Amino acid sequence: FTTEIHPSCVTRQKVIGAGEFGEVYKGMLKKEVPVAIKTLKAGYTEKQRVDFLGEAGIMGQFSHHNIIRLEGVISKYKPMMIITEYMENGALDKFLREKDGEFSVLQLVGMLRGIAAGMKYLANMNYVHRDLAARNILVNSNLVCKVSDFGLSRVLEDDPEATYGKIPIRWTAPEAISYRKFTSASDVWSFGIVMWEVMTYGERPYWELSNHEVMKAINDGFRLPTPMDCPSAIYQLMMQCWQQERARRPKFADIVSILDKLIRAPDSLKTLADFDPRVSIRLP
Ligand SMILES: Cc1cccc(Cl)c1NC(=O)c1cnc(Nc2cccc(C(=O)N[C@@H]3CCNC[C@H]3F)c2)s1
């Protein structure tokens, strides 16, 4: 099933994420290998237990470089724990915002290829993520990006960015907002937003537009503008992720292939899409 770990092998050291029902810790697994540790405090309900251990069950079924690896679970003792590999650099959105401009275009594009490879794996495994966003991508000390945040109802319920179904509007495909059609193709729309987040170093999609204004703009055909210093091929790809008609979007296999080709002929990334400025500075 999954690996049951004895509590004596686990040492919690730092809180890296807290919540009402539990906390996420950085720790060590047997003071030897660093791990992340997610707990479930006493008094949890049946639904909370199913959702909590269900996340571990889903992760245990995956084995991919760009998907968070499960080390094991503590279920025989309390509190219960999910133990995974430790991603040293945290969530991608916060990571990019705190390292603004510090990476090359080729590095940024390689992050996107890793994310896409993880999503292609998930889609082929018949797993729809529903909440793909930079905040749900984790980064390690090799700059590898791994898709995180698995489960069923639990995913959108626990994301504060998801607003009342209960979804994160700015990242969500129109068919999923409109009539709750979540598929790998709505994940592709979300991946286009993640592309835009990466190339902007964590800019907030649609900026200060309200949720209703975002839905209104999308339905009227508006799309996010080109990031600064963005390869033309990258902007073209994210625009095709945002096709209103779900059947016109690339599959993840197409995305990975295109990103592979660009990275392997890296001069192709030097052709930038035009950036339309929001300030005019004219000097005599
Ligand atoms: C444990 C677990 C259970 C179930 C699902 C999952 Cl995906 C997990 N694993 C995790 O939640 C995590 C795995 N790795 C994580 N790494 C992480 C997350 C958030 C912040 C940090 C972290 O150390 N962030 C910064 C990095 C730079 N400044 C110092 C640190 F605070 C690391 S969280």
XYZ file of C-alpha atoms and ligand atoms in Angstrom:
317
model
C 0.000 0.000 0.000
C 2.242 2.771 1.380
C 5.229 2.743 3.725
C 4.227 2.952 7.392
C 6.897 4.891 9.306
C 7.422 4.638 13.034
C 7.037 7.947 14.925
C 10.479 7.446 16.492
C 12.045 7.854 13.033
C 10.547 11.339 12.543
C 11.828 14.611 14.024
C 9.825 17.798 13.435
C 12.068 20.883 13.431
C 10.455 23.930 11.767
C 6.898 24.959 10.930
C 6.806 25.771 7.205
C 3.018 25.842 6.868
C 0.282 25.860 9.493
C -3.467 25.322 9.559
C -6.391 24.690 11.857
C -6.371 20.887 11.490
C -2.575 20.577 11.528
C 0.744 21.986 10.405
C 3.396 21.312 7.771
C 6.904 20.883 9.180
C 10.409 20.642 7.883
C 12.051 17.713 9.615
C 14.275 14.639 9.399
C 13.542 10.956 8.732
C 15.476 7.843 9.720
C 18.287 13.415 11.774
C 19.548 11.968 8.456
C 17.401 12.812 5.399
C 15.327 16.021 5.356
C 11.589 15.621 4.829
C 8.406 17.620 4.988
C 5.832 16.443 7.523
C 2.086 17.168 7.415
C 0.037 16.348 10.529
C -3.608 15.729 11.433
C -4.484 16.689 15.010
C -6.742 14.708 17.339
C -10.478 15.190 16.988
C -10.362 15.009 13.196
C -13.571 13.851 11.527
C -14.103 10.823 9.310
C -14.143 13.107 6.262
C -10.898 14.788 7.338
C -9.224 11.398 7.784
C -10.369 10.165 4.362
C -9.229 13.398 2.691
C -5.909 13.427 4.590
C -4.941 9.802 3.972
C -6.498 10.042 0.513
C -3.892 12.626 -0.445
C -1.182 10.166 0.587
C -2.881 7.313 -1.265
C -2.957 9.373 -4.465
C 0.683 10.448 -4.131
C 1.783 6.873 -3.411
C 0.423 5.860 -6.825
C 2.765 8.290 -8.633
C 6.439 7.929 -9.527
C 7.714 10.876 -11.558
C 10.582 13.382 -11.362
C 8.145 16.328 -11.405
C 5.609 15.029 -8.844
C 6.219 15.317 -5.096
C 7.529 11.989 -3.796
C 5.834 10.312 -0.832
C 8.200 8.869 1.770
C 5.478 7.270 3.877
C 2.731 7.789 6.424
C 2.186 7.486 10.151
C -1.341 6.136 10.575
C -0.930 3.626 13.431
C -0.147 6.430 15.894
C -1.485 9.897 16.641
C -1.168 12.481 15.383
C -1.199 11.049 11.876
C 1.498 12.234 9.494
C 2.284 12.364 5.786
C 6.013 12.467 5.075
C 7.345 13.604 1.687
C 10.590 14.778 0.182
C 11.566 18.265 1.322
C 11.568 20.993 -1.341
C 14.142 23.493 -0.093
C 12.931 26.559 -2.012
C 9.228 26.387 -1.158
C 6.285 27.421 -3.303
C 7.061 28.651 -6.810
C 4.982 31.829 -6.655
C 6.681 33.130 -3.503
C 10.055 31.887 -4.796
C 9.845 33.919 -8.008
C 8.563 37.043 -6.231
C 11.586 36.949 -3.902
C 14.114 36.341 -6.732
C 12.793 38.882 -9.246
C 14.955 38.953 -12.385
C 17.579 36.534 -11.013
C 17.165 33.767 -13.614
C 17.816 33.354 -17.307
C 15.027 32.883 -19.822
C 16.289 29.335 -20.440
C 16.083 28.594 -16.700
C 12.512 29.924 -16.525
C 11.494 27.855 -19.561
C 13.078 24.755 -18.027
C 10.902 25.234 -14.952
C 7.863 25.231 -17.250
C 9.039 22.081 -19.028
C 9.333 20.280 -15.696
C 5.847 21.401 -14.639
C 4.436 20.333 -18.011
C 6.106 16.913 -17.782
C 4.509 16.389 -14.368
C 1.108 17.457 -15.714
C 1.445 15.193 -18.758
C 2.120 12.299 -16.398
C -0.891 13.224 -14.252
C -3.218 13.617 -17.241
C -2.097 10.275 -18.696
C -2.701 8.714 -15.255
C -6.284 10.079 -15.490
C -5.772 12.541 -12.624
C -7.302 16.019 -13.047
C -5.597 18.532 -10.774
C -8.280 21.305 -10.687
C -5.971 23.732 -8.857
C -2.843 24.139 -10.992
C -1.087 27.385 -9.998
C 2.418 28.465 -9.036
C 1.398 28.446 -5.370
C 0.891 24.667 -5.742
C 4.291 24.032 -7.378
C 7.305 23.341 -5.158
C 10.972 23.997 -6.000
C 14.090 22.176 -4.773
C 17.773 23.164 -4.653
C 18.235 21.853 -8.228
C 15.543 24.313 -9.453
C 13.310 21.320 -10.253
C 9.605 22.180 -10.067
C 7.208 19.524 -8.788
C 3.412 19.539 -8.868
C 1.926 19.373 -5.348
C -1.486 19.594 -3.612
C -3.366 16.357 -4.402
C -6.735 14.971 -3.369
C -10.417 15.242 -4.207
C -12.732 17.878 -2.694
C -9.959 18.726 -0.293
C -7.903 20.603 -2.874
C -10.305 23.469 -3.627
C -11.713 23.500 -0.153
C -8.379 24.259 1.486
C -7.064 26.789 -1.058
C -7.908 30.310 0.194
C -7.531 31.660 -3.357
C -10.587 29.562 -4.258
C -13.710 31.668 -3.697
C -17.391 30.718 -3.597
C -18.538 26.074 -6.829
C -15.480 27.099 -4.794
C -12.694 27.661 -7.337
C -9.665 29.921 -7.961
C -11.225 32.049 -10.673
C -8.108 33.633 -12.226
C -6.540 30.199 -12.836
C -9.672 28.322 -13.907
C -10.895 27.490 -17.396
C -14.247 28.980 -18.496
C -16.011 25.625 -18.800
C -14.945 24.778 -15.242
C -16.194 28.111 -13.898
C -19.409 27.948 -15.922
C -20.628 24.381 -15.373
C -17.970 22.577 -13.287
C -16.329 20.707 -16.200
C -12.854 19.935 -14.812
C -10.639 17.953 -17.224
C -6.993 17.756 -18.219
C -7.887 20.445 -20.770
C -8.989 22.834 -18.034
C -5.664 22.019 -16.366
C -4.067 23.162 -19.646
C -5.752 26.554 -19.321
C -4.357 26.736 -15.784
C -0.931 25.772 -17.119
C -1.063 28.765 -19.451
C -1.610 30.961 -16.403
C 1.334 29.243 -14.687
C 3.463 30.036 -17.758
C 2.477 33.690 -17.330
C 3.244 33.597 -13.588
C 6.704 32.167 -14.249
C 7.678 34.608 -16.999
C 6.508 37.569 -14.860
C 8.275 36.395 -11.663
C 5.019 35.861 -9.820
C 2.845 38.750 -10.998
C -0.779 38.434 -9.931
C -2.907 37.386 -12.936
C -5.192 40.193 -14.175
C -3.686 42.409 -11.432
C -6.379 44.297 -9.534
C -9.367 43.177 -11.648
C -12.046 41.600 -9.488
C -13.107 37.981 -9.961
C -16.265 39.025 -11.770
C -14.269 41.416 -13.932
C -11.878 38.579 -14.845
C -14.727 36.285 -15.908
C -16.247 39.195 -17.857
C -12.963 40.031 -19.592
C -12.312 36.380 -20.497
C -15.805 35.824 -21.890
C -15.405 38.945 -24.055
C -12.155 37.568 -25.524
C -9.549 39.452 -23.502
C -6.395 37.585 -22.508
C -3.407 38.375 -20.319
C -0.860 40.567 -22.148
C 2.691 39.591 -23.022
C 5.163 39.593 -20.114
C 8.317 41.649 -20.365
C 11.261 39.833 -21.972
C 9.041 36.933 -23.013
C 10.023 34.653 -25.913
C 7.543 34.917 -28.771
C 7.235 31.114 -28.854
C 6.363 31.064 -25.138
C 3.655 33.734 -25.431
C 2.174 31.949 -28.461
C 2.020 28.707 -26.462
C 0.279 30.254 -23.453
C -2.216 31.999 -25.760
C -3.185 28.618 -27.218
C -3.676 27.253 -23.695
C -6.332 29.986 -23.331
C -8.559 29.024 -26.266
C -12.230 29.329 -25.325
C -13.000 26.036 -27.103
C -11.523 23.288 -24.927
C -11.003 20.991 -27.923
C -8.609 23.530 -29.525
C -6.148 23.645 -26.622
C -2.866 21.725 -26.811
C -2.640 18.495 -24.927
C 0.100 18.314 -22.322
C 2.019 15.977 -24.651
C 2.111 18.828 -27.185
C 3.239 21.335 -24.550
C 6.136 19.154 -23.356
C 7.225 18.452 -26.927
C 7.272 22.152 -27.878
C 9.089 23.143 -24.697
C 11.618 20.332 -25.269
C 12.335 21.616 -28.774
C 12.762 25.233 -27.643
C 15.159 24.300 -24.831
C 17.224 22.096 -27.163
C 17.514 24.909 -29.748
C 17.856 27.675 -27.143
C 18.506 30.460 -29.672
C 14.802 30.142 -30.557
C 14.050 31.773 -27.185
C 15.921 34.952 -28.171
C 13.041 36.104 -30.397
C 10.860 38.104 -27.995
C 7.224 39.059 -28.309
C 6.582 42.795 -28.350
C 5.774 44.274 -24.939
C 3.228 47.109 -24.960
C 4.276 49.620 -22.277
C 2.063 51.209 -19.623
C 4.324 54.264 -19.138
C 5.655 56.741 -21.699
C 9.044 58.216 -20.763
C 10.115 60.737 -23.416
C 13.403 62.597 -23.012
C 14.922 65.568 -24.946
C 4.410 16.865 3.680
C 3.464 16.873 2.657
C 2.265 16.187 2.823
C 1.311 16.187 1.808
C 1.549 16.869 0.617
C 2.748 17.556 0.438
Cl 3.037 18.397 -1.046
C 3.692 17.555 1.464
N 4.855 18.208 1.288
C 4.873 19.540 1.486
O 3.887 20.184 1.839
C 6.049 20.155 1.289
C 7.162 19.615 0.768
N 8.202 20.477 0.690
C 7.937 21.714 1.138
N 8.855 22.703 1.137
C 8.632 23.974 1.540
C 7.389 24.609 1.533
C 7.236 25.923 1.958
C 8.344 26.645 2.377
C 9.591 26.035 2.390
C 10.708 26.765 2.784
O 11.636 26.236 3.395
N 10.661 28.042 2.357
C 11.700 29.085 2.513
C 12.765 28.925 1.440
C 13.603 30.204 1.430
N 13.456 30.954 2.694
C 13.578 30.021 3.826
C 12.361 29.108 3.894
F 11.431 29.548 4.764
C 9.732 24.718 1.961
S 6.347 21.725 1.652
